[PDB]
Design a binder for this molecule. Sequence first.
Ligand code: A1JEN
Length: 339
Amino acid sequence: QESVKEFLAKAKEEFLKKWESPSQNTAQLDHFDRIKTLGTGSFGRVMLVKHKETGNHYAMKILDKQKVVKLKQIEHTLNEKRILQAVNFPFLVKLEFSFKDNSNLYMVMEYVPGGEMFSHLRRIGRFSEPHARFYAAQIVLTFEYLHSLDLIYRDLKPENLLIDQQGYIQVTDFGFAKRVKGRTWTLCGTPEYLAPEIILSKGYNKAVDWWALGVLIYEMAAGYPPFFADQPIQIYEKIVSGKVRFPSHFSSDLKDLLRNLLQVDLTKRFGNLKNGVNDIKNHKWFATTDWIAIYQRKVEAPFIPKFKGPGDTSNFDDYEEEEIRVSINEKCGKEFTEF
Ligand SMILES: O=C(c1ccccc1)N1CCN2C(=O)OC[C@H]2C1
């Protein structure tokens, strides 16, 4: 409808204005108190912090510049910050501040205290079809938004979907997202979620996000992903094969949607045909979904996470607490000039 077309046109206008003139240097480290490490690893660290003047809580992503260079993530890190400062959608975590110092890059995001979808899925075992469909509808709308801005997300998985105080999804981690007109070539993502054309080193497009949605829906409704194996090489052989097995408790409508999202031939995959996202939105598995009410956050969620307040960390896990050190000399200044 014309209302959807005009919404997406305005969404693109507003993205492009911030994309062409990015914000920079909007806070500094000694404006915050450090509380607790919420995650660590290949993505850097994420730390719960509290702003010393306002009292607000934030999730601060800290990247070590020297390690970013050695791991060949310079362009990806610049992508992440430039995109996050330019987007705006109900199901994306908001970037509030960004800055850099002699040693590190910092992205200060809103703190979502309900935890990762991954934790709740593994605790309950599997989600009922109505519960999985509620989350899936939010991802469909989010990808419609991102793809209309020429953005590919490239890291869909349960660990990257946080559950908020209303029971709705907020997507975090734009480390692999990129603005792409046409094809792109970089090997990235997490093994269980990679489309065949990534594994085969082809030039690929936004259809890889719709494949990943198929993997997510299967995992939410079954409790485990469709191409599971013990080692990555064995996972890749299953992905390229073009065969899956569905649990008997899956409905016929769910099986039909999944066969069309998990289509090995990218030219035949739902989301990538002449009708685009509407082949997904109009599928029988989504017949009960009120797309407008979901966007407006007017549907009652299947469950609300248990937590005590905006600073509660009980839904995240425990990590060794390490220093945030800042060298007396500047490191890698030229490489990160635009950050
Ligand atoms: O940024 C976060 C976060 C971590 C803790 C609290 C809030 C947010 N992530 C979740 C875990 N993550 C992965 O498993 O890989 C990507 C990374 C993203």
